[PDB]
Amino acid sequence: MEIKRFGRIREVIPLPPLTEIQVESYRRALQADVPPEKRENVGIQAAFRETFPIEEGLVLDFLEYRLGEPPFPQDECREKDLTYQAPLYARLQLIHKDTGLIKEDEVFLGHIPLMTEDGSFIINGADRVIVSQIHRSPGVYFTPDPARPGRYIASIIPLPKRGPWIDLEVEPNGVVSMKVNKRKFPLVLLLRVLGYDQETLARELGAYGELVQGLMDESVFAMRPEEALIRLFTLLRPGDPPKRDKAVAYVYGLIADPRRYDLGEAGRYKAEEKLGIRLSGRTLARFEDGEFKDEVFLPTLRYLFALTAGVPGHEVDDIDHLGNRRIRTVGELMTDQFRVGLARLARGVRERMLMGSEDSLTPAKLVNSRPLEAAIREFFSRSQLSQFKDETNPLSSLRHKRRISALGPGGLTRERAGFDVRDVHRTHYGRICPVETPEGANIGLITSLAAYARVDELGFIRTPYRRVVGGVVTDEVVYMTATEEDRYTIAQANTPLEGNRIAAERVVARRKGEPVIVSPEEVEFMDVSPKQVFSVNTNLIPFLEHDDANRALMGSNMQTQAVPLIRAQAPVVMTGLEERVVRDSLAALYAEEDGEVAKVDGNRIVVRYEDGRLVEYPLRRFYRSNQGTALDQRPRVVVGQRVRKGDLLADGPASENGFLALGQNVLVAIMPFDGYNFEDAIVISEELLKRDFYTSIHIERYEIEARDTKLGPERITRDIPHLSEAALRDLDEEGVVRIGAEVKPGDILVGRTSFKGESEPTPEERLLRSIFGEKARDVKDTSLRVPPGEGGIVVRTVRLRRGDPGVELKPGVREVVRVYVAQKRKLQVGDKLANRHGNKGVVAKILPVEDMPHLPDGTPVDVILNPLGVPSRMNLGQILETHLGLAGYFLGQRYISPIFDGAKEPEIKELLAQAFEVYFGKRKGEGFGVDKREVEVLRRAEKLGLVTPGKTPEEQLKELFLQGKVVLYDGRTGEPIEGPIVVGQMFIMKLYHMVEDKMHARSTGPYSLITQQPLGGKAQFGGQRFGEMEVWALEAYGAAHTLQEMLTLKSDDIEGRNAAYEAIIKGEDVPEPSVPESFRVLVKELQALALDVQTLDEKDNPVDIFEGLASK
Amino acid sequence: LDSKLKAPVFTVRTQGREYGEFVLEPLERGFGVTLGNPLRRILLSSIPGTAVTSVYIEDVLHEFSTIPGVKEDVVEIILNLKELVVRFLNPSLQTVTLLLKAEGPKEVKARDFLPVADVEIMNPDLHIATLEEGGRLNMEVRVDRGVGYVPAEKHGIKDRINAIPVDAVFSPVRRVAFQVEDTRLGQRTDLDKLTLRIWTDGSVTPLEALNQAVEILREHLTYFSNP
Amino acid sequence: RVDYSGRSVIVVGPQLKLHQCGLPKRMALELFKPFLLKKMEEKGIAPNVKAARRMLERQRDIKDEVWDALEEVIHGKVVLLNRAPTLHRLGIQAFQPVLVEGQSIQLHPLVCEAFNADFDGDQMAVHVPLSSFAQAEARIQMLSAHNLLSPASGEPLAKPSRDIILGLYY
Amino acid sequence: AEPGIDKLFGMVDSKYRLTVVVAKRAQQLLRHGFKNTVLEPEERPKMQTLEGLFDDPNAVTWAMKELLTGRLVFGENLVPEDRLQKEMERLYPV
Amino acid sequence: AXXXXXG
Amino acid sequence: PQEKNSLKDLVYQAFLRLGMEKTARLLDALKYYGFTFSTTSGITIGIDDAVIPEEKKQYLEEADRKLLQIEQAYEMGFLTDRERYDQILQLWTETTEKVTQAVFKNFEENYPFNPLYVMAQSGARGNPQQIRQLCGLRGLMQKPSGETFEVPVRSSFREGLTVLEYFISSHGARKGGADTALRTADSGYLTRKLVDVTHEIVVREADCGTTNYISVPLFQPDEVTRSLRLRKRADIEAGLYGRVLAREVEVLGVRLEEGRYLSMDDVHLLIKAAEAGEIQEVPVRSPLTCQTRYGVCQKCYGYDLSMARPVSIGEAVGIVAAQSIGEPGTQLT
Amino acid sequence: GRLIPAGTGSDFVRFTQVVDQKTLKAIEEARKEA
DNA sequence: TATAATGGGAGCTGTCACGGATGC
DNA sequence: GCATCCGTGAGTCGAG
């Protein structure tokens, strides 16, 4: 159908690759395509350069490294629960100094995981994503002292785990103090160690306001750098012998050692920019010609005194500024952990260098790769910043890869974060999305990267701007750091332009974030687009300008939760970003070059290009995602079809013809309905289920292991003791459920028998045995069964057996069987729906079509929304979307309305008129006039002041229709709704929160080991936690027996619960409860602390709750 | 797919001739309000009854005037005449004119109306007006048979020049209220339960009223017969 | 953590009386399960307890008579509905359960304000009082219709809001 | 709301004493199999089954409705516990 | 992520 | 017309007079007819249902004038930067108030049945400020520092915000969110501390026989210091209703006896008497003066506020108290 | 895990006994005999 | 069971808050 | 008597 796009804003540049930060970071770190000699010193190369050479005698040096090919492809790694990775080889050479012997060998360091094309990883068969970490950028900062108003604190910050933060402060007694590892000592001493003399400090700092004299100490200058050095070592190392070389080593390692101390390249640059100096290295000082030489400290102290005195050109720093904060991407974190593991490897190397045969040592004998591996794995498996990938829809993955976390190792602990850290900084413009952050505990600490935003090589986020010269807007684009942005007056993207020239006398612009009205002569730069201010998700919200930010947050967050539907459609009203999202997420399949399509199948698509080559693209079909959403590609092309470069070959999940489909376009009427839509609840039509709208496929994986035991082996078999053929009906010869079979709760997916524990039969069992004359079988039924509330059709079975080619399991396991069960979920009561504007609700009622409010022509609405949700939530974007949707319903078209530049009320009125001519004038030719009900409603509307009195019925109906309202007939009555109701097409998604995955109930079940309380969780078939607050509720109600019953009978009291259940099944009232087991646990644990806890009567005579079992 | 349906059973609960309750369950899903609404519309508008369509009183010019010797105004007397329940014993009789003449210290009731052939007053104890010493009340009231509710302006009938047009309430049914509750037959989940409540004036019993309402509807279904 | 308890997503019954709440059939079957076994043995549905339990184990083995038996079981009984966080005693209330198709718990509108619960996907937990004592406590003390006023302010905590006020004002 | 709950709250000095009384009476009825009821056959609480009306299985309903009649006597130290037990066992064997 | 259920 | 307050008073009065069963039936009835009538009322929300008053434009232009004046005053040195700032802020605040009043006056006079106006007035949904944001100007916005921008958002949500306006508002939005998330934890903590300190308090007896009591003042000093003025209704109600009189009180020829639980009507009577100048303070039995060990007595505690009658012995007062204080905690700004 | 000293667990209301008139009078005759 | 070998090694840092002692 | 150090706490479901 026709797609009408609005807006006058022309974007000069498109959006960059949205995954580019992940891909380019990891690629930069690896340098796998760069020949060994051409590799810059960065990433793992840098780690090798720091770790080597290793001395102490023998010397093990480093030449180059290489990454081999992955032993297994991505898919196969996903299936076999293997990590997708490449082997890392490193060429080393051992050199004995005296002998001169050189033994060179290539050593195998293990594997490193490789990033996939979409920017994610595969670890142990599970897709994972490394979230970027925002932190304080290294450098030199100056901040106002909270205690002392006229004094300032200098702070020298290196990279995380690169060595200590150093604090320079002017003490109340006048002396300048330095703080390292929580130790306060006069800076004078260190300055003497650096080789400074009283003369040099006097001439350098002299112009200052007597601040110099605080640095003046006669006892310090009376001694040479050596004595001062030993003095400093005695100050920083109490009890440690003040040996000369040990002091030199400690101080060098503290400051000058590049191996143990590293400023960032960004820290280096910023330090050079702030202090106005030049660094020969990333360290605060150097060891040169036997002594220490000062790189940094003196300019820092100089700047401190200069700021304190009030000397012009010296500023305090904003640590929340995005010029002072930087982003650590995948490559940097990976490089860090790699460097740690490599250091451990080095310790191992020197260790093995001390012990051994000194004559014969190969690099292989010295190198134990294990720690290195152990590091990398540890960073991928257990790290805070390594997250389980969200595969829910393509936008989920894309957004997940664009995450920015202030948390993590070396980052903010929670409740270390005040309002400042979580605040939206003025420099967040065009860089970090102000809209998208989680609600609750993570707010502001977890953010999303802006669409046009880019992270530079230093780790700072940069946003694009257009160069403006003399009122002319060039197509030249410049990406700026916040520090660079602060230097310019930057116009807004909506400022009127005739050609390339500014058409307004007064143009709205920003100076250091501050709003200001300026002349075209004053404008240096101009915004690229309103899109650059927000995250990709936020940019998917039409009429965003009409929605309150707090609701836009929810609308943004919930698109991530959108479940892919079989019938899923692109929104009627789009922001025009729907295609790029599908493209960059690698959801859909596209044509590599121009050519003709050869073969078309559900499984695969063969294409012949201009090269004459035949390329076959296999289609991913019904593959289970991380969240269990079905990911399947479907062919959008037919045999013989001519396709150009970039054309769409096949549609990915949640994609309609290349456009992002998060849900359905439904006809909604906004009215209160019988209290069924009360408080955000939603009422939907059965016709939605009839045509399979909001129907989604979900695949669950079940897994069972047969292992060797000391009591005899477990085995998967179709022979299960004490079971009828009826139960074994769908089981195959080997005991596994067949493909295509329907499974319900209680059914057996995989039959398994296990040898019983050693059994001493109770006399009852023996007597009953003699009565029925049947030998008690050797094994028992352990078979994996369908968990309560689950089920479906079995679409796959995997069987891995030990002793079979290409298959080796973990020790003791005989074999492993997996069963994949798919189910088709129709929308039901309790499922969660939401729109892009932040209006969310659970479906309360599904009415039959005849109960649904309908149009005069007989067309029933899909969804009934309550208007009460609108005013307090202040999101009007859904209203406008509804109106334009009403227009596009009868006009049979869809629209593109970009954010902040888009469809305006008058234009929508035009489109609604065009729509009305189709909706009404059709009726007039059909031989029907205005209905009586329409007349009544028109009277009501006349009194309402919606329509002008005196006009014909058609004119008034047109007036209502233009306001987006129509006459609506109640299904049950046939009488019209008294007022005209707003009706129109709205794009609504079914979120991942579904009543089926949630609803749970328990009579009795498994209990915890020590506490003997019921387990938590649904999969554990656990009970609901009754906590302190619930207990408070029961106490306030004054219900003693209910509460006591919860604490004892229901749980944690063994005799109590057994007796209670037995009594209930017997038809007897429950008995008197007894002492809860966890109290006994408390008593014994208190005894383990050597505290005697005695339960006494009123006679103060001991009462034994253990009943003599604990007393000798 | 394969469906079996037996029942409903029609249950009746009655208090005198003034009231009744009717319960029809189980019904197929949606049939609760499908039966309910039409009957309510028919019961209110289409049920035959009697009303006072005009009133003449001596010496009074119009409706907002007052009557010397009588404590109630012309307005109040008209209101009481609206609540008068008249029943026509003969199905042939379309309309009656009832005369009332009384004076002195007396309280006029519906009994005081001079009896007419085949005309029964259901509520003879209904109060019309109180007269004082010297008070004189002479009135002729027009009673017609019809349906629904007709304002005094719409019928516009006058026997004489001083005859006052009265809002005419024909419908013997005072109120109809129904409620549809979800009920279950065996494992059938969504089945509807219809409960009907009818208020009458006693001239026509609720059960009679309902049976007339379903007959009217059934008769309308036969109108689809011959194009 | 306690036995005889469950949870689900809440949906508003308009049709519920103030003392009532919709309880999904399966949830009730699991919550009342021992009582259901007893009632099943009392009638001709099962020979004994164990047979009845094995009968309820598989979903395809479940017939209509056990649902009616379940209806007989819960009669006159009440269950506790609780929404986290519980800020005050009204955070848990007693309702006479109404067996309903679907996996959602049905809540009465008027108590929502007391629970600070809405229909946007809030969930609630169900607890089953066992003893006649506990049941009596729930009915007399904890019944939703039995507390109409705020223990804090003395003002009504149960009262028209949203749609109700809208219609009445209209 | 429970039928005549206001009157039941009027009967006792503390709202909880009502609960204790109703609960204990319910336990009496359960133990003695309803044979000790003070309710006349017409006053019996009824449950609607598939077959027809039957005696209400709920002991608390019975207890409250009994308490509403005034046919029950409540208070502290009426008789000794074991004596009450043995007498109720004599009159209505379980 | 918490609050009233964006995430 | 029936709205939230009158309906609330209806529920309360019906509780008092007719009891909680009939009150419950009344509640269900109100629910039924409320929903039923709200269904067919015709209430909906269109974009034109948010009505921008003409007056607003005037109020903008006028503002733009006054600003200039202020600016002039800054040019010639009559106003310091901070003075200018404050004057601009005050100007925009008063302007905002004016456009609000314009919106609601336009609604009341011209479109009384307008959906936003209806929902606002009835108490169903919305307050004056939100409606003001929809129809009128969005208003002033705060910087991250808490400082306010000199430039307010002049756009409504109906007109839609400019990019810069939105970005300016995001600071306030984020601040509010973080405020919520951080508030929840401390509120909960406080609740638990209160629960822990008061948990042992229960009502253990009918009377502790204390002759001690407290005097709830019906009058309070005025910030003008001029004289004593009558306290607000709700406060006096908060310190009076349900409590037992510790001494005889004779006002307006009405005897309020010692030992009397004060009904709402009794409180209102006491207020009338206070206005008549007969009584400036009320002696009352208080938990503060209660001599009952490990708790309070019945006469000192007074009403069970849930049942609107004397508290039942055995009710746990401490927990109810702690919860009563703790629940609103998340609403404290 | 004991019975809390509040509400139904209060010593005040927890010792209350319930007896029907028939049983009460039987016990009354039992006391009347001795 | 025997050449002699003789004081370790990571630390990682943007809360606050009272409050309770301890120390100057 | 005041300055400063240390130890302890920091809201509930639900799933991981």
Ligand SMILES: [Mg+2]
């Ligand atoms: Mg139905």
Ligand SMILES: [Mg+2]
């Ligand atoms: Mg809410």
Ligand SMILES: [Mg+2]
């Ligand atoms: Mg919610």
Ligand SMILES: [Zn+2]
């Ligand atoms: Zn007291």
